[PDB]
CSV table of C-alpha atoms and ligand atoms in Angstrom, one decimal:
chain,number,residue,atom,x,y,z
A,83,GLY,CA,93.4,246.6,215.6
A,84,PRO,CA,92.8,249.3,213.1
A,85,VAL,CA,90.0,249.4,210.8
A,86,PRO,CA,91.3,248.6,207.3
A,87,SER,CA,90.5,251.5,204.5
A,88,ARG,CA,90.9,251.5,200.5
A,89,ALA,CA,90.7,254.4,198.2
A,90,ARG,CA,87.2,255.1,196.9
A,91,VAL,CA,88.7,255.9,193.2
A,92,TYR,CA,91.9,254.4,191.3
A,93,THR,CA,91.8,251.6,193.6
A,94,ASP,CA,93.0,248.8,191.5
A,95,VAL,CA,95.2,250.5,188.9
A,96,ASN,CA,98.2,248.8,189.9
A,97,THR,CA,96.8,245.4,190.4
A,98,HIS,CA,95.6,245.2,186.8
A,99,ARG,CA,98.9,247.0,185.3
A,100,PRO,CA,101.9,244.6,184.4
A,101,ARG,CA,104.1,243.8,187.3
A,102,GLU,CA,107.1,245.9,185.5
A,103,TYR,CA,105.0,249.0,185.9
A,104,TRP,CA,104.8,249.0,189.8
A,105,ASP,CA,107.6,246.6,190.7
A,106,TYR,CA,110.4,249.6,190.9
A,107,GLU,CA,113.0,247.3,192.7
A,108,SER,CA,113.4,245.3,189.2
A,109,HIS,CA,113.7,248.4,187.0
A,110,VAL,CA,116.6,248.8,184.8
A,111,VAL,CA,117.9,252.5,184.4
A,112,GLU,CA,118.9,253.5,180.9
A,113,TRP,CA,121.6,255.7,181.3
A,114,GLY,CA,122.4,258.8,179.5
A,115,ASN,CA,125.6,260.6,178.6
A,116,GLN,CA,127.0,262.6,181.6
A,117,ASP,CA,129.3,264.7,179.6
A,118,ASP,CA,125.9,266.1,177.7
A,119,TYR,CA,125.4,268.1,180.8
A,120,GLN,CA,127.3,271.3,182.0
A,121,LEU,CA,126.6,272.6,185.7
A,122,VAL,CA,126.2,276.3,185.5
A,123,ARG,CA,125.1,277.3,189.3
A,124,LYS,CA,123.9,275.6,192.5
A,125,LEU,CA,120.2,276.3,193.1
A,126,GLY,CA,119.7,274.8,196.3
A,127,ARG,CA,120.3,271.6,198.4
A,128,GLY,CA,117.6,269.4,200.0
A,129,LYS,CA,117.4,266.5,202.5
A,130,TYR,CA,117.8,264.2,199.7
A,131,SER,CA,119.4,266.2,196.8
A,132,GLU,CA,121.4,269.0,195.4
A,133,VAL,CA,119.6,271.2,192.4
A,134,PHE,CA,121.7,272.7,189.6
A,135,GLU,CA,121.0,275.0,186.8
A,136,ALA,CA,122.9,273.4,183.7
A,137,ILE,CA,123.0,273.5,180.1
A,138,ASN,CA,122.5,270.6,177.8
A,139,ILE,CA,125.4,271.3,175.4
A,140,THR,CA,123.7,268.9,172.7
A,141,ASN,CA,120.9,271.9,172.2
A,142,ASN,CA,122.3,274.6,174.3
A,143,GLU,CA,119.2,274.6,176.2
A,144,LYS,CA,118.7,275.0,180.0
A,145,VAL,CA,117.9,272.2,182.2
A,146,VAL,CA,117.7,271.6,185.9
A,147,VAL,CA,120.0,268.9,187.4
A,148,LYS,CA,118.9,267.0,190.5
A,149,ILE,CA,121.9,264.9,192.0
A,150,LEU,CA,120.8,262.4,194.3
A,151,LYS,CA,122.4,262.1,198.1
A,152,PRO,CA,123.3,258.5,198.9
A,153,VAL,CA,120.2,256.6,199.8
A,154,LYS,CA,118.8,253.3,199.3
A,155,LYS,CA,118.8,252.0,195.8
A,156,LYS,CA,115.0,251.3,196.3
A,157,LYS,CA,114.2,254.9,197.2
A,158,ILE,CA,116.1,256.1,194.1
A,159,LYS,CA,114.5,253.5,191.9
A,160,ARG,CA,111.2,254.1,193.0
A,161,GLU,CA,111.6,257.8,192.2
A,162,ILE,CA,112.8,257.2,188.7
A,163,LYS,CA,110.3,254.5,187.8
A,164,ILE,CA,107.5,257.1,189.0
A,165,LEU,CA,109.0,259.9,186.9
A,166,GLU,CA,109.2,257.5,183.9
A,167,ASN,CA,105.3,256.5,184.4
A,168,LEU,CA,104.1,259.7,184.7
A,169,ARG,CA,106.1,261.4,182.0
A,170,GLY,CA,104.1,263.5,179.6
A,171,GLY,CA,101.3,263.6,181.9
A,172,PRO,CA,99.7,266.9,182.6
A,173,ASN,CA,101.8,269.5,184.5
A,174,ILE,CA,104.0,266.7,185.6
A,175,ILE,CA,107.7,267.8,185.5
A,176,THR,CA,109.4,265.9,182.7
A,177,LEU,CA,112.4,263.6,183.4
A,178,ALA,CA,114.5,264.0,180.3
A,179,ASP,CA,117.6,262.2,181.0
A,180,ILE,CA,119.4,260.3,183.8
A,181,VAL,CA,123.1,260.1,184.2
A,182,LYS,CA,125.7,258.6,186.7
A,183,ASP,CA,127.3,261.3,188.4
A,184,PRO,CA,131.3,260.8,188.6
A,185,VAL,CA,131.8,262.8,191.6
A,186,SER,CA,128.9,261.8,193.9
A,187,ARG,CA,128.8,258.5,192.7
A,188,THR,CA,124.8,258.9,192.5
A,189,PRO,CA,122.2,259.2,189.8
A,190,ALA,CA,121.6,262.7,188.5
A,191,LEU,CA,118.1,263.5,187.1
A,192,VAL,CA,117.8,265.9,184.2
A,193,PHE,CA,114.9,267.8,184.2
A,194,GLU,CA,113.1,270.2,182.0
A,195,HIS,CA,113.7,273.7,182.8
A,196,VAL,CA,110.8,275.9,184.7
A,197,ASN,CA,111.5,279.8,185.1
A,198,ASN,CA,109.9,279.7,188.3
A,199,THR,CA,109.4,282.6,190.8
A,200,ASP,CA,109.4,281.8,194.3
A,201,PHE,CA,106.2,281.0,196.2
A,202,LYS,CA,107.3,283.4,199.0
A,203,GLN,CA,107.1,286.4,196.7
A,204,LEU,CA,104.9,284.7,193.9
A,205,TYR,CA,101.9,284.1,196.7
A,206,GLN,CA,101.9,287.7,197.6
A,207,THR,CA,100.8,288.9,193.9
A,208,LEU,CA,98.5,285.9,192.9
A,209,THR,CA,94.8,287.2,192.2
A,210,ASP,CA,91.6,285.5,192.8
A,211,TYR,CA,91.5,284.5,189.3
A,212,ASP,CA,95.2,283.2,189.3
A,213,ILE,CA,94.6,281.0,192.4
A,214,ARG,CA,91.8,279.2,191.0
A,215,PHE,CA,93.9,279.0,187.7
A,216,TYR,CA,96.8,277.2,189.4
A,217,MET,CA,94.7,275.2,191.8
A,218,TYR,CA,93.1,273.6,188.6
A,219,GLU,CA,96.4,272.9,187.0
A,220,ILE,CA,97.6,271.5,190.0
A,221,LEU,CA,94.4,269.0,190.2
A,222,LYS,CA,95.4,268.0,186.7
A,223,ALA,CA,98.6,266.6,187.7
A,224,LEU,CA,97.0,265.1,190.8
A,225,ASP,CA,94.2,263.5,189.1
A,226,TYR,CA,96.5,262.2,186.6
A,227,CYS,CA,99.1,260.7,189.0
A,228,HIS,CA,96.2,259.2,191.1
A,229,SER,CA,94.7,257.9,187.8
A,230,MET,CA,98.4,256.2,187.1
A,231,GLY,CA,98.4,254.5,190.6
A,232,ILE,CA,100.8,257.0,192.5
A,233,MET,CA,100.3,259.3,195.3
A,234,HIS,CA,103.0,262.0,195.5
A,235,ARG,CA,102.6,262.5,199.4
A,236,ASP,CA,104.8,265.9,199.2
A,237,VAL,CA,102.3,268.5,198.1
A,238,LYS,CA,103.5,271.7,199.3
A,239,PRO,CA,104.1,275.4,197.7
A,240,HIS,CA,107.9,274.3,197.4
A,241,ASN,CA,107.2,271.4,195.1
A,242,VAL,CA,104.8,273.5,192.8
A,243,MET,CA,107.1,275.2,190.2
A,244,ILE,CA,105.4,278.2,188.5
A,245,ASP,CA,106.2,280.2,185.3
A,246,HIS,CA,103.9,282.7,186.0
A,247,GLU,CA,105.0,284.6,182.6
A,248,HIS,CA,103.5,281.8,180.6
A,249,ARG,CA,101.1,280.4,183.1
A,250,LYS,CA,102.9,277.2,183.0
A,251,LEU,CA,102.9,274.9,186.4
A,252,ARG,CA,104.8,271.8,187.3
A,253,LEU,CA,104.4,269.4,190.3
A,254,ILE,CA,107.9,268.5,191.2
A,255,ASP,CA,110.0,266.3,193.8
A,256,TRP,CA,108.7,262.8,193.3
A,257,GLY,CA,111.1,261.6,196.0
A,258,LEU,CA,108.6,260.7,198.2
A,259,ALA,CA,106.1,259.3,196.0
A,260,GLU,CA,104.7,255.7,196.1
A,261,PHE,CA,102.6,253.3,194.2
A,262,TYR,CA,99.0,252.7,196.0
A,263,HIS,CA,98.3,249.0,196.5
A,264,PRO,CA,94.9,248.2,198.2
A,265,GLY,CA,95.7,247.5,201.9
A,266,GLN,CA,99.2,248.2,201.7
A,267,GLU,CA,100.4,250.0,205.1
A,268,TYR,CA,102.7,252.8,204.3
A,269,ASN,CA,105.1,254.9,206.1
A,270,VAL,CA,103.5,258.2,208.1
A,271,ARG,CA,106.7,259.8,208.0
A,272,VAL,CA,106.0,261.8,204.7
A,273,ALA,CA,105.1,265.4,203.8
A,274,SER,CA,106.1,268.6,205.6
A,275,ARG,CA,104.9,269.4,208.9
A,276,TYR,CA,102.4,271.8,207.7
A,277,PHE,CA,100.8,269.7,204.9
A,278,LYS,CA,100.5,266.4,206.8
A,279,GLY,CA,97.2,265.1,206.8
A,280,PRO,CA,95.5,263.6,210.0
A,281,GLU,CA,96.1,260.3,209.0
A,282,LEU,CA,99.6,260.7,209.5
A,283,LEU,CA,99.5,262.6,212.6
A,284,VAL,CA,97.5,260.0,214.2
A,285,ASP,CA,99.9,257.0,212.9
A,286,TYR,CA,97.1,255.5,210.5
A,287,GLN,CA,99.2,253.8,207.8
A,288,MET,CA,96.5,252.4,205.4
A,289,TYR,CA,96.2,255.8,203.7
A,290,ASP,CA,95.9,256.6,200.0
A,291,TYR,CA,95.5,259.3,197.3
A,292,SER,CA,93.3,261.3,199.6
A,293,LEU,CA,96.3,262.6,201.5
A,294,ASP,CA,97.5,264.8,198.8
A,295,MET,CA,94.1,266.3,199.0
A,296,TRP,CA,94.4,267.4,202.7
A,297,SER,CA,98.1,268.8,201.6
A,298,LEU,CA,96.2,270.9,198.8
A,299,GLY,CA,93.7,272.0,201.2
A,300,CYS,CA,96.4,273.4,203.3
A,301,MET,CA,98.0,275.2,200.1
A,302,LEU,CA,94.6,276.5,199.3
A,303,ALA,CA,93.9,277.7,202.8
A,304,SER,CA,97.1,279.9,202.9
A,305,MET,CA,96.7,281.1,199.4
A,306,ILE,CA,93.0,282.4,199.9
A,307,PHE,CA,93.5,283.7,203.6
A,308,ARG,CA,97.0,284.8,203.0
A,309,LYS,CA,98.7,283.0,206.0
A,310,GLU,CA,101.5,281.0,205.1
A,311,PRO,CA,101.3,278.0,206.5
A,312,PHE,CA,97.8,278.1,207.5
A,313,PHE,CA,98.2,275.2,210.3
A,314,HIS,CA,101.6,276.3,211.7
A,315,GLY,CA,102.5,273.7,214.4
A,316,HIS,CA,105.7,273.8,216.4
A,317,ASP,CA,106.1,269.7,216.0
A,318,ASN,CA,103.6,267.1,214.9
A,319,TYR,CA,101.8,266.7,218.1
A,320,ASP,CA,100.9,270.6,218.1
A,321,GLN,CA,100.2,270.0,214.3
A,322,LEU,CA,97.1,268.3,215.1
A,323,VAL,CA,96.0,270.5,218.0
A,324,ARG,CA,96.3,273.3,215.6
A,325,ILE,CA,93.9,271.3,213.1
A,326,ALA,CA,91.6,270.6,215.6
A,327,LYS,CA,91.1,274.0,216.9
A,328,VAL,CA,89.5,274.6,213.4
A,329,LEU,CA,87.8,271.4,212.6
A,330,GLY,CA,87.0,270.6,216.3
A,331,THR,CA,87.8,267.9,218.7
A,332,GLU,CA,84.4,266.0,218.4
A,333,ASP,CA,84.9,265.3,214.8
A,334,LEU,CA,88.5,264.3,215.3
A,335,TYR,CA,87.4,261.6,217.9
A,336,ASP,CA,84.5,260.5,215.3
A,337,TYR,CA,87.6,260.1,212.6
A,338,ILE,CA,89.5,258.0,215.2
A,339,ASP,CA,86.7,256.0,216.4
A,340,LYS,CA,85.7,255.2,212.8
A,341,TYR,CA,89.1,253.5,212.0
A,342,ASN,CA,89.2,252.1,215.9
A,343,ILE,CA,92.5,254.3,216.2
A,344,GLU,CA,93.7,255.4,219.5
A,345,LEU,CA,95.4,259.0,220.0
A,346,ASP,CA,98.7,259.1,221.7
A,347,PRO,CA,98.0,259.5,225.4
A,348,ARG,CA,100.6,262.6,225.5
A,349,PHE,CA,97.5,264.5,223.7
A,350,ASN,CA,95.4,264.0,227.1
A,351,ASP,CA,97.2,267.4,228.3
A,352,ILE,CA,97.3,269.3,225.1
A,353,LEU,CA,94.7,268.7,223.0
A,354,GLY,CA,91.6,270.4,224.9
A,355,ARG,CA,87.9,270.8,223.8
A,356,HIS,CA,87.4,272.9,220.7
A,357,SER,CA,84.3,273.3,218.7
A,358,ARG,CA,84.1,273.4,215.0
A,359,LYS,CA,84.8,276.9,213.4
A,360,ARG,CA,83.1,278.5,210.4
A,361,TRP,CA,85.8,279.2,207.6
A,362,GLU,CA,84.2,283.0,207.6
A,363,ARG,CA,86.3,283.7,211.0
A,364,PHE,CA,89.5,283.7,208.9
A,365,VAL,CA,88.2,286.5,206.2
A,366,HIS,CA,89.4,290.0,206.9
A,367,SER,CA,89.5,293.1,205.0
A,368,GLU,CA,93.2,292.0,203.7
A,369,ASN,CA,92.2,288.7,202.2
A,370,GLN,CA,88.5,289.1,201.2
A,371,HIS,CA,89.3,289.7,197.9
A,372,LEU,CA,90.6,286.1,197.5
A,373,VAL,CA,87.5,284.7,199.3
A,374,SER,CA,84.3,283.8,198.0
A,375,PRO,CA,81.4,281.1,198.9
A,376,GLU,CA,82.8,278.8,196.4
A,377,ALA,CA,86.1,279.1,197.7
A,378,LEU,CA,84.9,278.5,201.2
A,379,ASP,CA,82.9,275.5,200.3
A,380,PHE,CA,85.9,274.0,198.0
A,381,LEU,CA,88.2,274.5,200.9
A,382,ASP,CA,85.7,272.8,203.3
A,383,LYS,CA,85.2,269.7,201.3
A,384,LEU,CA,89.4,269.1,201.0
A,385,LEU,CA,90.0,269.8,204.6
A,386,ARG,CA,88.2,266.6,206.1
A,387,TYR,CA,89.5,264.5,209.0
A,388,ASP,CA,88.2,261.3,207.5
A,389,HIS,CA,90.4,260.8,204.2
A,390,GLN,CA,87.3,258.8,202.8
A,391,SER,CA,85.4,262.0,203.2
A,392,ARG,CA,87.6,264.5,201.0
A,393,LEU,CA,86.9,265.3,197.3
A,394,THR,CA,88.8,263.2,194.9
A,395,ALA,CA,90.9,265.2,192.4
A,396,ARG,CA,88.4,264.8,189.6
A,397,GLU,CA,85.6,265.5,192.0
A,398,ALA,CA,87.4,268.8,192.9
A,399,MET,CA,87.7,270.0,189.2
A,400,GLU,CA,84.1,269.6,189.1
A,401,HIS,CA,83.6,272.2,191.9
A,402,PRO,CA,81.8,275.6,191.2
A,403,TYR,CA,85.0,277.5,192.6
A,404,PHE,CA,86.5,276.7,188.8
A,405,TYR,CA,83.5,277.8,186.8
A,406,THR,CA,85.1,281.1,186.2
A,407,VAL,CA,88.4,279.8,185.2
A,408,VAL,CA,88.9,279.7,181.5
A,409,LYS,CA,88.9,276.0,180.1
A,410,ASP,CA,91.3,275.5,177.1
B,609,K0N,C1,113.9,268.9,194.4
B,609,K0N,O1,113.5,267.9,193.4
B,609,K0N,C2,113.1,268.3,192.3
B,609,K0N,C3,113.4,269.8,191.9
B,609,K0N,C4,113.3,270.3,190.6
B,609,K0N,C5,113.5,271.5,190.1
B,609,K0N,C6,113.8,272.7,190.9
B,609,K0N,C7,114.1,272.7,192.2
B,609,K0N,N1,114.2,272.6,193.4
B,609,K0N,C8,114.2,273.7,190.3
B,609,K0N,O2,113.9,274.2,188.9
B,609,K0N,N2,114.5,275.2,191.0
B,609,K0N,C9,114.7,276.3,190.5
B,609,K0N,N3,115.1,277.4,191.2
B,609,K0N,N4,115.3,278.6,190.4
B,609,K0N,C10,115.1,278.4,189.3
B,609,K0N,C11,115.4,279.3,187.8
B,609,K0N,C12,114.1,279.7,187.5
B,609,K0N,C13,116.2,280.4,188.5
B,609,K0N,C14,116.4,278.7,187.0
B,609,K0N,S1,114.9,276.7,188.9
B,609,K0N,C15,112.7,269.2,189.7
B,609,K0N,C16,112.3,267.9,190.0
B,609,K0N,C17,112.4,267.6,191.2
B,609,K0N,O3,112.4,266.3,191.5
């Protein structure tokens, strides 16, 4: 069988919390007044929700309303409980209210309003300094939620809201997030394809917070090299091949051998043999102003096959890449 694995940090946060903290199936939702919120416009529809801009008519302030699609009361209560546990943490989107939508017959989560610029256009204008700054802000959110026993499991540009005018960042969509319990096996069908960690792609279920750090590394690579997404697989198998063309196949075999994992035999005809590459080959005249020795070393220390070898969020915040970021 597979060799077990444990997070190297925040390992026992939930076992020493009171049961109510992580036992989300027993959570009792405190419902607000649905008539407080007037929907203004539909902003988007996801796999699991529709998102609206709205007005809170008790203060005439704009809010965002996420009306959940019908899913298991378990998955709904999980997201609600995680948002309440994390509320007020650095750069965590603030759940302001929860109401029963009378049309959908599902909960509608009310969030603080973030005046966001879409990552498609925003990523075209970010400077070297901008990228370091916003990476540091994401790390504050990830260290916070990891320190609170929670992994996000869906870190990607779409879930990082940035109000660039006020340099304000919020990590959103906690609908895939989970509580970390040592030795628990988790669903590997999380995260968007381009941001899935090697652990998901080789079907290793005993993963942890370090999954988020791979995803973050994928975002960093797309930003400093101006190639979004960086690992651009056509499916989940080709996704691992794309990673192995950069990190090399010998270290992939070291990874799966360490955890006594077996690759899907369908890789025998697609994976090939690939050397590990040096990150400088992705540097060119149109991205070099975003690349530094510190950026490449930081990236290299996030994008490890072995989830146990990646920088933690707190370690990442100590990295020289952030020395130039002005600290508040
Ligand atoms: C999909 O889960 C979530 C989504 C959100 C929020 C948004 C999304 N998605 C959001 O605020 N999207 C916007 N798109 N344009 C905006 C203007 C600045 C034009 C008003 S806001 C918050 C918490 C969640 O859990």
